[PDB]
């Protein structure tokens, strides 16, 4: 009952921005914003998305996002009634927050329960008036859907964050204020992560008219640093970022050196007038507290609203505080001239640009800068230089100013992260890319993007870090192969309920020339085979030669089949374990029980391979009489009654398959007699030996004598289902350890494969681990229709690695977690700064079939 | 041009709440709230202040403030257009912030330019809908009057604060979130003070209907901890507090041990459901981080909204985190049951109660607690106990919770300040209480309250700390006497322009019996007189005996007159300097020039007293033939010519009055001839001497010889206006130092009093410093009508201390800064916790003649 106090201690490490996502004017994702910025494309347009271009005399051009009517409600657990009475800003913010979380290499399960704080910045409350004009019952939910305090809380509620959730309104400087609050809470020890963000959507034209009444808005776009500047143009943003401790971040766009806030105070020019002195003091304080040399700043994202009275003061402060002592012009810019003014969200906009400038290593151009402002001496003195075209920002510090209406200035500094990517052993060999999404089209787009970056392993690691989300959240599970000779792609909708995984190990009959030869490409497979060969070498067996240069004649012998089959099974088990597949159940045929024991942990590699070798040695050394085994088409009881003398039913494979075996003469006459009555008695070439019959009475004991001194008794887990000891005898001691007695019993007693398969559920994923899918038909007939059956290898296939990857992709698509990157050396985190952005794919991979209510112009008039 | 960086370093000291003010339901000030709380008076009433009791089916009872239509716009520099388009919440918050600043012993000039941050908490935005329904031009000012971000910024703009100004919206718990932010900014070194506050007004009945739609509201009042509780009732608050560093605070209600915040995270009971586990974890974290023994809490201000699902969870957390190990029941309570639910401002309400509980040393009772809730176990096991009646809280820690909707919780701990008051040497003697206000009625109420606390000196010091505000801000200046035998009270409206203060020192003739006997009550006056007497003792003069036991026969001689008048002048100058009155100009009559020299700093106490003693000795040592002086009502040009040889004109008193001085025979004859013609030859006693004439040739030289070895030449400041050397010789060297030459010249040459008085402005406040008010008529006739004339003493008055205090009160009322408390030992800060609150006086002393626009119900329907 007592609760352990949380350790709240100061943090002295670095704070890194890991994820970024958002909706920007004429941009549905960060990638579109980057493309528009780097192509000198104006994101402010003239249309009637919100209202007619000129309604009530408002300015025609505006910065508007593509759509504000879509929201994946069922993903966030919001019923239709709540979603309808939900601000579009909050819905877009939730989607953007999830996209940013995914971008930083995190996932729903990883971010749940963490000490993360939300610091949303929102001020637009026009939705209240729109929805309250004709208020009726069932609109009560608005309290939890429209209130500005619920914007962060909802984010904390869905992601299960347990940190300070707050909504800020400082106007224009609000986003950097939220960043400062997040930094303050991070450095005191309250939280380890922050979800700093902000939103701003335009709904009310009368708000634009009221803004124009104060001369805030101009005629043309935001001509920042231009002599013709006379105002700004309203814009829309729904962006958010994720902050973390640099020692635990999996991706670091940059590092937050420090942020600071202040107020201009009292001035004789009015409350709505920037104070250059206060801004200069703020910048001096921030640059002196952190000992940052102001001459090292390479780029400066200014608060270039384009106003005549605003730009000169910002420029004067910059020159007096930052350009003092600089030996080269300081590159200044502002994103307002590109996508307009974001209002309360403006602070986030610049941050986004900074991340872009700190990810692509290029400074986006500034638009509408034709003639320098004569009131700006710096532009003529060489101290300042507006970036009118792409510039190669190599590295350093970037400073952002977000001065706000009313007089609350804010400054922040970011340090670049220089970890340029280096080659990986992978990125030139086939790889398995597994992911999940909400829609089939989104998953296909994600796979296309992954193929576009098939040569990047850091991107694959970032995708995999969030590729194990439960089917309940992301139902469309898919798998593909990058750098594949043959195109492969599987996508399927997986039910919320989780199915059971049942490893199935095959016995004899799966041998062939070239087994596992392709799989030698994988390092883990080759290492496992080499270890097995080294273990078996002291016994005069060269596994490497048999597996690589072995021929059909060699495989005809008794030992090489057992040795190679066991080695391949062990290698496949090692591969699966390295990937991280946990078998909920284990079953095996004859000679497959050793593999089941090895996988279950009751046996070891050396003990398993020695058990197989001892089985082969006992079979060969003993002069077991000319024997015969045959797969009759009789039922278990019917075969147990037709069995003549010197003939006993060995393997109950399927409900219509028996492996009746005995002496060669007795087996021959019984075969002809069964074919006389008429049944499909095919001969199973068992190296002319009758296993699991009375003829095994001598070898089995020998095997025991061979294995009594090697196999250390160990308990058998409930996962492993014995196929040699009847259920009625499971409770007895003999069925508790896989010692030499167990091996002798399974080599002697009949194989109850059907009985073991009966224990499998009706919708379990059974993975057939063997050199070839020998038991595919038997397992399919046994389990049923609702059970998925896969084979990790195909007989005489031209490329078994592709078959292995395809089977594993199918298994993942059916809803079994795995780590495809476990077959290669782990990627060192944080990843290189060259890794692409994962936010876009999630942004365009949403389920947006339904359309929700949006405020209408007619609701603002009355 | 370079700016000195501010030193931003961590703060490890204590944070203290200094000021508190606010408007609460059925309470216009903190005093009314305290009285109602301690008298078990329900603050929620039924009436049509906002809307009809039942309009739209909303609950009839509600918590509403007295008025929201009042605002002193001219005080805050807000024009009528801006004030009209200004939220009533913002106006009330500004007034409350000023009242809280005054309460903490601070003033406008003291708080200007400080590194203070504003952390306003506001969520209500219904005013926008009301004002935009019929929007027309001239309403653009709503950006700077209605936007939430302007709530703190305005406070920062008016008071000239240069710290982070922010507006928080965290639903309920917003006030505690702002307190946490203020603590974060205080401990990191950005700011030294904080203006944490919040407001919440109700305008829209449809909002109440919306809240009822979710079952938030109940039927009756908030029955916290009652089995019949089914909801809460909305309330209104506009309260704010001031925080400071404990080492600079002049008043400390309590100390902020620590505050913390967290979120309930994800739960299966819905987003709008309290999480007991999260609250318990928050309590454990806060009580473990600060090492505070949870068993030391005496009172617990709970978030007792009265809801069935809220109170049990909060109480469970409280008795699982705080009551564990307690040996006595923990006294729990909530202010919601008294004045309803404040919503966004709810937190501040609790803080207010805490301050009251931490000021009056009594816990206010909890209303409507009749039957304990069966679901709350702690009320039956003795762990908890709801305070149903006033309880004597002696001291310790008080914890406050502000759990809000969504799940964002907040906890804070306050430590009591135990500095019980001790007696002062004052509080039983008459004192001068000077103050300023916006209205005459407010100033009268302030004086009444001060008289009510006439026995408290800490309250007087707190009032004094803000009693020197410039007339431009507070025009009504007033002065009264506490512990006065005779009632005195002066109040006057002082123009914004500051007048010039001119000390005037009178000469001979002001002698009488008892001069300064009453003024001996003051310590400074007595010490000054004792110092002068000790200095003069080596020369065989007992100043003490003459001043106290002296008789008319004493003043019949020459030496005692000079000695006593000069000693009184020095004592009065010392008193004025101690009170902190800086004379902008100095002038004096004959024998008063020594006083002007002493007050100007060119002369010292010893040098002045010895100059006077030498003046008297030069006439009582060398033989001077008998002569006389008269007061002929001739002009200077008339008298100077009318007088025969020997008779001359001595002092130019005013535009028509001239002293004439000569030999006893020449005089008598010329005076008689004058008397023949219409002229008032009113003879004056001079001990048969004729000062400032040719007869004074011999003494003056002697005086020089006496003073050449004592008076060290020192420069004469421009403030001192010489009355012996005409303007034509002021630039000459002789008029540069008040050495023996100056004394001889002034004792010899004529006194140009009229010429010196001409230099005084037309509206200067002239203070006549002398044992008696002689030159009142002459000075009044000299300057004119627009100048203020005051005399510090009155001849043969029965109580000269009262006359002196009344003179100082008039001088202050006419606009001269002073420190009446400088006559007594300085009060040690912070003051004792028993000092009353100064916020109520300012709250009830506003200028509320005008009525401004308020949202109307009809504007919310359309």
- Identify the residue among A172, A174, A234, A406 best suited for mutation to test binding to B, counting B beta carbons within 10 A and taking the highest: A406
Chain centroid to Cα A201, Å, comes to: 30
d(CA A100, CA A20): 5
Contact A359, A251 (CB under 8 A): no
User: Has B460 been annotated as catalytic?
Assistant: no
Q: How far is A378 from chain B (nearest CA, A)?
A: 16
- b/e A326-363 (16+ beta carbons within 10 angstroms → b): beeebbbbbbbbbbbbbbbbbbbbbbbbbbbbbbbbbb
| Mutation choice for B interface testing from A153, A185, A292, A473 by most B CBs within 10 A | A153
Distances (CA, A) of A682 to A591, A634, A672, A675, A775: 21, 12, 11, 10, 16
User: Active-site residue among B303, B359, B652, B814?
Assistant: B303
- Which residues is A384 bridged to in the sheet? A330
- Identify the helix (H) or strand (E) that includes residue B198: strand B197-198
Rounded CA-CA distance A167/B173 in Å is 12
Q: Which residue has the tokens 């800068």?
A: A369
- CA–CA separation, A621 vs A623, rounded Å? 6
Q: What angle do CA A72, A75, A81 make, to 5 degrees?
A: 65
> Distance between CA atoms of A738 and A711, rounded to whole angstroms?
8
Annotate B23-57 with b (16+ C-beta within 10 A) or e (fewer).
Answer: bbbbbbbbbbbbebbeeeebbbeeeeebbeeeeee
Q: CB distance A272–B139 less than 8 Å? A: no
The dihedral over CA atoms of A492, A493, A496, A501, expressed in degrees to the nearest 10, equals -10
Residue in B129, B135, B149 nearest the CB of A123 = B149
Among candidates A162, A188, A262 on the partner chain, residue whose Cβ is nearest the Cβ of B163: A262
Q: CA separation (Å) from B253 to B353, B361, B456? A: 12, 11, 17
C-beta separation of A431 from A820 below 8 A: yes
Tell me how far apart the alpha carbons of residues A626 and B478 are, in angstroms, rounded to a whole number: 130
Query: Which tokens in the block code for residue A572?
Result: 């496949």
**What is the C-alpha separation between B386 and B306, in angstroms, rounded?**
13
For an interface test with B, the pick among A187, A190, A263 (most B C-beta atoms closer than 10 Å) comes out as A263
Distance from C-alpha of A199 to C-alpha of A120, rounded to nearest angstrom: 8
The end-to-end CA distance of chain A, in Å, is 57
* DSSP-assigned states of every residue in A572-597: HHHHHHHHT---SEEEE-TTTHHHHH
Residue B831 CB-half CA count within 13 A = 27
| Cβ atoms of residues A811 and A805 within 8 Å | no
**A79 in active site:** no
Rounded Cα distance, A739 and A734, in Å? 9
Residue of A578, A583, A571, A570 lying closest to A503 (CA atoms): A583
Pairwise CA distance, residues A338 & A223, whole Å: 9
Backbone angles phi, psi at A53, to 5 degrees: -70, 80
Closest residue in B to A171 (Cα–Cα): B149
Residues A628 and A661: their CA atoms lie apart, in Å, by 6
3-state secondary structure A649-671: CCEEEECCEECCEEEHHHHHHHH
Crossing angle for the helix pair B559-579 and B605-621, nearest 10 degrees? 170
Label residue B216 exposed, middle or buried (CB < 10 Å: 0-12, 13-18, 19+).
Answer: buried
C-alpha–C-alpha distance, residues B673 and B670, integer Å: 5
Q: Tally DSSP H helices, then E strands, for chain A.
A: 31, 27
Name the DSSP class of B363: B
Whole-number Å distance between alpha carbons of A321 and B4: 11
Residue B823 in tokens: 């006559």
The residue from A341, A368, A411, A460 that is catalytic is A341
- Strand B476-482 and strand A627-631: the pairing is unpaired
Task: Write phi, then psi, for B263 (nearest 5 degrees).
Answer: -125, 145
Q: Which positions in chain A touch B209 (Cβ < 8 Å)? A: 135
Q: Of B153, B164, B407, which has the smallest distance from its Cβ to A406's Cβ?
A: B153
Helix, strand or coil, per DSSP, at residue B649: strand
The C-alpha of B279 sits at a distance from chain A's nearest C-alpha, in angstroms, of: 11
Query: From 3.40.50.720, 3.20.20.70, 3.40.47.10, 3.40.640.10, which CATH number describes the B15-416 domain?
Result: 3.40.47.10
Closest CA to B593 of B613, B608, B572, B578: B608
CA torsion sign, B419 to B424 to B429 to B430? negative
Answer for the pair B103, B838: CB distance below 8 angstroms, yes or no. yes
Helix (H/G/I), strand (E/B), else coil: B84:
helix
Tell me which H or E stretch contains B415: strand B408-416
Note whether B271 contacts A153, CB cutoff 8 Å. yes
How far is CA B344 from each of CA A310, A665, B174, B199, rounded to the nearest angstrom? 34, 96, 6, 7
Nearest CA among A438, A506, A435, A510 for reference residue A474: A438
DSSP letter string, B812-848? HHTT----GGGGSPPPPSSPPTTS--SHHHHHTS---
Task: Evaluate whether the domain defined by A499-516+535-621+714-783 bears CATH number 3.40.366.10.
Answer: yes
Instruction: Quote the tokens at residue A91.
Output: 């819905």
Contacts of A128 in chain B (CB under 8 A): 125, 129
Which chain B residue has the Cα nearest residue A264?
B162
Q: How far is CA A486 from CA A450, A459, A771, in A?
A: 16, 22, 21
Sign of the CA dihedral A581, A587, A591, A597?
Answer: positive
CA atoms of A44 and A221, how far apart (whole Å): 8
User: Pick from B144, B209, B265: which is nearest to A156 by CB?
Assistant: B265
Q: Is B433 helix (H, G, I), strand (E, B) or coil?
A: strand
CB contact under 8 Å between A167 and B168, yes or no, is: yes
Q: Which residues pair with B226 in a beta bridge?
A: B372
Cα distances (Å, whole numbers) of residue A332 to A206, A311, B745: 34, 12, 73
Which of B120, B203, B262, B412 would best serve as a mutation to test chain A binding (most A beta carbons within 10 A)?
A: B262
Alpha-helix runs per DSSP H in A550-653: 552-556, 559-579, 593-600, 605-621, 636-642
Give the residue from A91, A34, A467, A443 showing the smallest Cα distance to A253: A34
Structure tokens at B822: 């400088």
> Alpha helix (H) ranges present in A394-522?
440-452, 457-464
Q: How far apart are CA B88 and CA B82, in angstroms?
A: 12
Q: Are A568 and A532 in contact (CB under 8 A)?
A: no
Residues B596, B608: Cα–Cα separation, whole Å: 10
Please name the residue of chain B whose CA is at the shortest distance from the CA of residue A408: B165
Instruction: Give dist(CA A183, CA A161) in Å, integer.
Output: 17
Distances (CA, A) of B432 to A295, B435, B788, B804: 59, 10, 20, 10
Cα A94 to Cα A654: distance, rounded to the nearest angstrom: 53
Q: Where are chain B's structural domains?
A: 15-416
Tell me whether residues B262 and A164 touch, CB distance under 8 A: yes
The strand ranges marked E within B101-156 are: 116-121
CB contact under 8 A, B184 and A180: no
Q: How many CB atoms lie within 10 A of CB A292?
A: 17
User: Of the candidates B322, B323, B337, B329, which has an alpha carbon nearest to the alpha carbon of residue B411?
Assistant: B322
The alpha-carbon gap from B160 to the nearest alpha carbon of chain A, in Å, equals 4
Q: Report the residue of chain A nearest B285, measured CA to CA.
A: A5
User: What are the start-end ranges of the E strands in A706-771?
Assistant: 765-769
Region for B132 from its dihedrals, namely left if φ exceeds 0, alpha if ψ lies in -120 to 50, beta otherwise:
alpha
Counting one residue from A and one from B, how many pairs have CB atoms under 8 Å apart? Answer: 259
Q: Is residue A750 within 8 Å of residue A586, measured between CB atoms? A: no
Are the beta carbons of B164 and A3 separated by less than 8 Å? no
CB contact under 8 A, B150 and A158: no
Q: Which of B148, B158, B185 sits opposite A169 (nearest CB)?
A: B148
Say if CB A755 and CB A727 are below 8 A apart. Answer: yes
* Angle at which helices A740-748 and A697-707 cross, to 10°: 160
Kindly determine whether residue B135 and residue A206, on different chains, have CB atoms separated by under 8 Å: yes
Length of chain B: 862
* Residue located via tokens 């390092």: A523
Q: Could you give phi then psi for residue B139, rounded to 5 degrees?
A: -95, 5
- Write a three-state SS string for B462-501: HHHCCCCCCCCCCCEEEEEEECCCCCCEEEEECCCCCCCE
Task: Please report, for residues A273, A410, B122, the alpha-carbon distance to residue B117 in angstroms, rounded to integers and kept in the order given.
Answer: 19, 14, 16
- The SS3 assignment for A718 reads coil
d(CA A83, nearest CA chain B) in Å: 14
The single residue listed with the structure tokens 């759509």 is A67
Q: Which residues of A touch B118 (CB under 8 A)?
A: 263
How many residues are given for chain A?
Answer: 862
Is residue B364 within 8 Å of residue B37, measured between CB atoms? yes
Residue A36, classed as helix, strand or coil, is: helix
Chosen from A116, A266, A274 to mutate, greatest number of chain B CBs within 10 A: A266
> Is A302 noted as a catalytic residue in this protein?
no
Cross-chain Cβ contact A408/B135 below 8 Å? no
* Closest by Cβ to B184, choosing from A135, A184, A862: A184
A-chain residues near B287 (CB < 8 A): 5
For residue A326, report the phi and psi dihedrals to the nearest 5 degrees. -65, 140
Which residues of chain B does A281 touch, with a Cβ-Cβ cutoff of 8 Å?
3, 6, 162
**What sign does the CA torsion over A518, A521, A524, A529 have?**
positive
User: Closest by alpha carbon to A38, among A271, A431, A356, A380?
Assistant: A356
């Amino acid at each position: 009952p007592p609760k352990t106090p949380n350790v709240v201690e100061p943090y002295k490490g670095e704070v890194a921005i890991c994820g970024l996502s958002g909706r920007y004017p004429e941009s549905a994702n960060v990638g579109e914003l980057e493309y528009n910025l780097f192509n000198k494309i104006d994101m402010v347009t003239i249309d009637n998305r919100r209202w007619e271009p000129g309604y009530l005399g408002t300015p025609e051009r505006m910065g508007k996002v593509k759509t504000i009517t879509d929201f994946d409600a069922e993903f966030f657990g919001v019923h239709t009634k709540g979603a309808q009475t939900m601000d579009p800003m909050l819905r877009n913010l939730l989607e953007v927050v999830y996209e940013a979380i995914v971008d930083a290499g995190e996932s729903l399960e990883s971010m749940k329960g963490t000490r993360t704080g939300v610091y949303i910045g929102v001020s637009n409350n026009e939705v209240d008036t729109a929805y309250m004009k004709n208020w009726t019952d069932d609109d009560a939910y608005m309290v939890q859907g429209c209130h500005h305090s619920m914007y962060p809380n909802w984010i904390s509620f869905f992601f299960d964050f347990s940190g300070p959730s707050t909504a800020y309104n400082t106007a224009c400087s609000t986003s950097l204020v939220c960043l400062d609050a997040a930094e303050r809470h991070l450095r005191m020890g309250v939280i380890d992560n922050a979800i700093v963000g902000g939103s701003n959507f335009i709904y009310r034209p009368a708000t634009t008219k009221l803004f124009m009444g104060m001369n805030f808005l101009g005629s043309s776009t935001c001509k920042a640093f231009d002599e013709s500047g006379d105002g700004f143009v309203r814009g829309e943003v729904a962006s958010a970022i994720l902050l973390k401790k640099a020692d635990t971040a999996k991706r670091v766009y940059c590092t937050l050196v420090g942020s600071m806030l202040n107020n201009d105070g009292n001035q004789t020019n009015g409350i709505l007038y920037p104070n250059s002195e206060a801004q200069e003091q703020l910048m001096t304080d921030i640059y002196s507290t952190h000992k940052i040399d102001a001459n090292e700043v390479k780029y400066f994202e200014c608060h270039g609203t384009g106003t005549q009275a605003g730009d000169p003061n910002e420029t004067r402060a910059i020159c007096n505080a930052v350009c003092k002592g600089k030996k080269d012009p300081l590159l200044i810019g502002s994103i307002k001239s590109n996508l307009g003014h974001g209002e309360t969200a403006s602070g986030i906009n610049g941050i986004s640009k900074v991340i872009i400038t700190m990810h692509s290593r290029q400074i986006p151009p500034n638009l509408h800068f034709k003639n320098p402002n004569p009131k700006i001496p710096g532009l003529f003195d060489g101290r300042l230089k507006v970036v009118t075209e792409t510039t190669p920002f190599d590295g350093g510090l970037i400073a952002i100013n977000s001065f706000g209406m009313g007089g609350t200035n804010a400054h922040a500094i970011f340090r670049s992260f220089d970890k340029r990517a280096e080659p990986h052993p992978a990125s030139d060999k086939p790889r398995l890319f597994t992911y999940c999404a909400r829609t089939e089209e989104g998953l296909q787009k994600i796979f296309e993007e992954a193929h576009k970056h098939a040569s990047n392993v850091e991107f694959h690691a970032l995708c995999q870090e969030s590729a194990n989300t439960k089917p309940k959240s992301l139902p469309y599970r898919g798998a593909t192969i990058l750098n594949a000779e043959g195109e492969y792609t599987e996508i399927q909708k997986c039910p919320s309920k989780a199915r059971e995984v049942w490893f199935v190990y095959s016995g004899m009959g799966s041998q062939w020339v070239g087994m596992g030869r392709s799989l030698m490409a994988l390092d883990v497979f080759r290492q496992s085979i080499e270890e097995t060969a080294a273990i078996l070498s002291p016994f005069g067996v060269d596994l490497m030669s048999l597996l690589m240069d072995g021929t059909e004649d060699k495989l005809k012998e008794i030992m090489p089949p057992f040795i190679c089959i066991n080695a391949i099974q062990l290698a496949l088990t090692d591969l699966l374990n390295s990937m991280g597949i946990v078998p909920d159940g284990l079953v095996g045929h004859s000679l497959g029980e050793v593999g089941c024991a090895y996988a279950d942990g009751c046996l070891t590699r050396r003990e398993a391979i020695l058990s197989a070798f001892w089985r082969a040695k006992a079979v060969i050394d003993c002069e077991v009489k000319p024997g015969k085994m045959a797969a009759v088409e009789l039922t278990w009881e019917e075969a147990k009654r037709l069995c003549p003398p010197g003939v006993v039913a060995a393997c109950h494979n399927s409900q219509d398959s028996v492996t009746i075996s005995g002496g060669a003469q007795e087996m021959t006459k019984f075969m002809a007699e069964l074919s006389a009555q008429g049944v499909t008695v095919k001969e199973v070439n068992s190296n002319n030996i009758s296993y699991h019959s009375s003829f095994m009475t001598e070898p089995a004991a020998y095997l025991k004598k061979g294995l009594e001194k090697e196999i250390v008794p160990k308990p058998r887990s409930k996962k492993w289902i014995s196929t040699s000891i009847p259920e009625e005898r499971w409770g007895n001691p003999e069925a508790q350890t896989a010692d030499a007695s167990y091996q002798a019993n399974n080599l002697l007693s009949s194989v109850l494969f059907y009985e073991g398969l009966q224990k499998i559920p009706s919708n379990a994923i059974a993975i057939e681990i063997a050199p070839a899918g020998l038991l595919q038909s038997v397992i399919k007939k046994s389990l049923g229709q609702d059970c998925t059956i896969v084979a990790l290898q195909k007989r005489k296939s031209p490329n078994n690695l592709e078959v292995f990857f395809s089977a594993l992709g199918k298994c993942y698509s059916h809803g079994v977690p795995m780590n495809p990157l476990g077959l290669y050396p782990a990627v060192q985190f944080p990843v290189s700064i060259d890794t692409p952005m994962l936010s876009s794919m999630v942004s365009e991979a949403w389920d947006h079939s339904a359309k929700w209510r949006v405020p209408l112009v007619e609701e603002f008039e009355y």
